[PDB]
């Protein structure tokens, strides 16, 4: 139908879906795949600033995001495997065992364990209009 199938929010070119439920990162990816959506990846601050619009979604929830970490290198990429700019990348802890692809907790990107459950957000291109 319209630029976004229902229950999706549009921001410019993109369409976003905030999942009702918790899924694992990989799992949500498969789920996202079903739609033909992807996980959301944040190319710009502008897009990141839009996240706040999640804020109305009740409370902040952690939301799985595109960025993934290699493990040996620990380099952060998105599913497409581009490089996030500095702004996107994660924050530090003293140390421990474990770490995986980022989520979004409200304002800022974060990292966690995949095995854990988190809400994921998917992104698709809106049917951009041409005349």
């Amino acid at each position: 139908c319209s630029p976004c199938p229902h229950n999706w929010i549009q921001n410019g070119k993109s369409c976003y879906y905030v999942f009702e439920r918790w899924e694992m990162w990989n799992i949500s990816k498969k789920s996202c795949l079903k739609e033909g959506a992807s996980l959301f990846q944040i190319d710009s601050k502008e897009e990141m600033e839009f996240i706040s619009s999640i804020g109305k979604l009740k409370g902040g929830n952690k939301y799985w995001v595109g960025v993934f970490q290699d493990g040996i290198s620990g380099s952060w990429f998105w599913e497409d495997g581009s490089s996030p700019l500095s702004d996107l990348l994660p924050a530090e802890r003293q140390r421990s065992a474990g770490q995986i692809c980022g989520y979004l907790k409200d304002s800022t990107l974060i990292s966690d364990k995949c095995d854990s459950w988190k809400y994921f957000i998917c992104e698709k291109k809106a049917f951009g209009s041409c005349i």
């Binding site: 229950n7 009702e20 009740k58």
Partner: protein, 374 residues
């Protein structure tokens, strides 16, 4: 001029409906509550109506208080009730009660004492030329127009199933349910509140009510529906609160109405509708049963859920012997069906003797309306 109509007023638990006979549907329908400022306090001037409620309360919402003088569909009080009747006549109908006959309608177990009082008001204060006392269950049936079948009537306060064979309702078959939309909304509130919303208030009451009526639906399979819910994108539907919050409502929509099917949600021991239907059937003769099964009729506000009909056929068919044919029917605007039947009976030229008259009030007293008449 000459000729007379019958005023058809059904004194609903929540919403009373009244009109003229011959009308297809009630001219008036308004809240049946009483309400004031809880806070009050005070002002320069007034111009307020202390406890109209009515339309104005509903618009009123935040300010006012609600009593229902007939919550359990039973005139719990005469003082307020007169007010409803007064409002109905003068305000909404803008008829003079002097001119026309009225049919009041009554809830099913209405103790023969109140009936006399119902009558005495109409004669005494109202001074109607004549009035009839009706049983709303009946009037609903009258509207339907079918002799045999087993109809499920779920309204606001109460749910019944009644087998009907030629036209006579077999008393014994019937069984009562406490549950109806009345409970449903409360429940809706309660589930809503878990998530974090708090819908404690009366204003909030009405908000909850709105949410269920548009929003809520009945599941094909209760179990499947939960399971789906997890994946379910769809269920997520938004509702905008009057303030401007937007609150999201997935699962509750199906869970709420489910209660009718499974009363234990609400903590009713009582069996769900389907068990009800089966039971009422059993109670009757083996021979008759087929007739009911073919003709099941739905009725009342609570029956309006889309999906009910298919669930019912699904449910019943499992229960019933594979031979027996099962049909389900649901007339389109059933909620009104009570008023409708009332309307019809009232109008009846032929039946007119049935109406209760001023003299009869005098000689026999109001009790006449109860005895060897309605």
């Amino acid at each position: 001029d000459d000729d007379i109509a019958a005023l058809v007023v059904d004194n609903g638990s929540g919403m009373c409906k009244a009109g003229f006979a011959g009308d297809d549907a009630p001219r008036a329908v308004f809240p049946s509550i009483v309400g004031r400022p809880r806070h009050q306090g005070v002002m320069v001037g007034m111009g307020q109506k202390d406890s109209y409620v009515g339309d104005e309360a509903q618009s009123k919402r935040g300010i006012l208080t609600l009593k229902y003088p007939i919550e359990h569909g039973i005139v719990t009080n005469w003082d307020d009730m007169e007010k409803i009747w007064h409002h109905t006549f003068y305000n909404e109908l803008r008829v003079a009660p002097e001119e026309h006959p009225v049919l009041l309608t009554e809830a099913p177990l209405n103790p023969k004492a109140n009936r006399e009082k119902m009558t005495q008001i109409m004669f005494e204060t109202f001074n109607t030329p004549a009035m009839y006392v009706a049983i709303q269950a009946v009037l609903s049936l009258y509207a339907s127009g079918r002799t045999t079948g087993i109809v499920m009537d779920s309204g606001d306060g109460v749910t019944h199933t009644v087998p009907i064979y030629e036209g006579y309702a077999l008393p014994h078959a019937i069984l009562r349910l406490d549950l109806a939309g009345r409970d449903l909304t409360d429940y809706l509130m309660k589930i809503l509140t878990e998530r974090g919303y708090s819908f404690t208030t009366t204003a909030e009451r009405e908000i909850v009510r709105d949410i269920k009526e548009k929003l809520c639906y009945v599941a094909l399979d209760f179990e499947q529906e939960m399971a789906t819910a997890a994946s379910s994108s769809s269920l997520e539907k938004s509702y905008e609160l009057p303030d401007g919050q937007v609150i999201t409502i997935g699962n509750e929509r199906f869970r709420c109405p489910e209660a009718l099917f499974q009363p234990s949600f609400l903590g009713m021991e009582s069996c769900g509708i389907h068990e009800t239907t089966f039971n009422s059937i059993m109670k009757c003769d083996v021979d008759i049963r087929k007739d009911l099964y073919a003709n099941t009729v739905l009725s009342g506000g609570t029956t309006m859920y889309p999906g009910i009909a298919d669930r019912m056929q699904k449910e019943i068919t499992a229960l019933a012997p594979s031979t027996m044919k099962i049909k389900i029917i649901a007339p389109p605007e059933r909620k009104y069906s009570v008023w409708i039947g009332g309307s019809i009976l009232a109008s009846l030229s032929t039946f007119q003797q049935m109406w209760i008259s001023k003299q009869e009030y005098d000689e026999s007293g109001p009790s006449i309306v109860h005895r060897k008449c309605f």
